[PDB]
Amino acid sequence: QADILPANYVVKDRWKVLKKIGGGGFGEIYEAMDLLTRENVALKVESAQQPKQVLKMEVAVLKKLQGKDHVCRFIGCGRNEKFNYVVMQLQGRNLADLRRSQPRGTFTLSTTLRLGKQILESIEAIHSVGFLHRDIKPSNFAMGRLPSTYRKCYMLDFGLARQYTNTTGDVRPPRNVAGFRGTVRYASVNAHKNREMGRHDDLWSLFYMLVEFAVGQLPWRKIKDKEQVGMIKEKYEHRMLLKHMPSEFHLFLDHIASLDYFTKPDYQLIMSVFENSMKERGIAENEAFDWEK
């Protein structure tokens, strides 16, 4: 109905809103200027009157992940009468926009495999601190916007994230039904069947992304009905998806198909598939990205 923060509004006498860059549902994201440090920042705001409060745990997750790569630096957070906010490091173009920018809407295996390695490190990272992301998709990963960071992929929105552990590190018992409230294009069949998601379901999203990066489409690309996408995925011969993909990816598929809610994944196996695939084709970490020149 209206922006929570209007343009040139200033938060806690430090962060001057510039423009709206995201939001619409369950909160808003702003580009803002840090009047102290003089750099532009990501300012996420939730209405304090809002019923469902995700920004609390976003901060929680974002705080446990400080000191790991592929995670935005935590600047500030605060509560007040009209809104809650978090202040973050600003990142660059997300992978969804970067894939649409390419002709054929595809990435060379050079880029696809190197993105896979970074995305997998950060999926292991969030798992390492007892949280599922549960919204793994290209628009939730961005390249840095600095000389130090322009070749680093960052994991972005922790608003659908869930704690699968406790302090002791025991796995939390699943719900018989947990309703899937997310983008269905990269959803695993478990998510589609409204079962408690696991670490595997984040790797299912990783799998489906890397296919769409290399092939340029998924068989269910057109369909906008949630039920139909799930029934197509439930029956589809996933081997087909690998027809034009490195043969090592068959290892990736067979492993994730074996896992259930409780089984910790082999993150090193999946990482090997990418390393080995690059190894065979003489791809190296110093090689340019399709959007560079």
From Swiss-Prot:
The active site is at residue 135. ATP binds at residues 21-29, 44. Disulfide bonds: none annotated. It is found in: Cytoplasm. Expressed in the brain, particularly in cortical and hippocampal neurons. Weakly expressed in spinal cord and testis. No expression in adipose tissue, bladder, cervix, colon, esophagus, heart, kidney, liver, lung, ovary, placenta, prostate, skeletal muscle, small intestine, spleen, testis, thymus, thyroid or trachea. Residues 15-278 form the Protein kinase domain. Belongs to the protein kinase superfamily. CK1 Ser/Thr protein kinase family. Serine/threonine kinase which is able to phosphorylate TAU on serine, threonine and tyrosine residues. Induces aggregation of TAU. This is Tau-tubulin kinase 1. The lineage of its organism: Eukaryota, Metazoa, Chordata, Craniata, Vertebrata. The chain holds residues 20 to 312 of 1321 of the full protein.
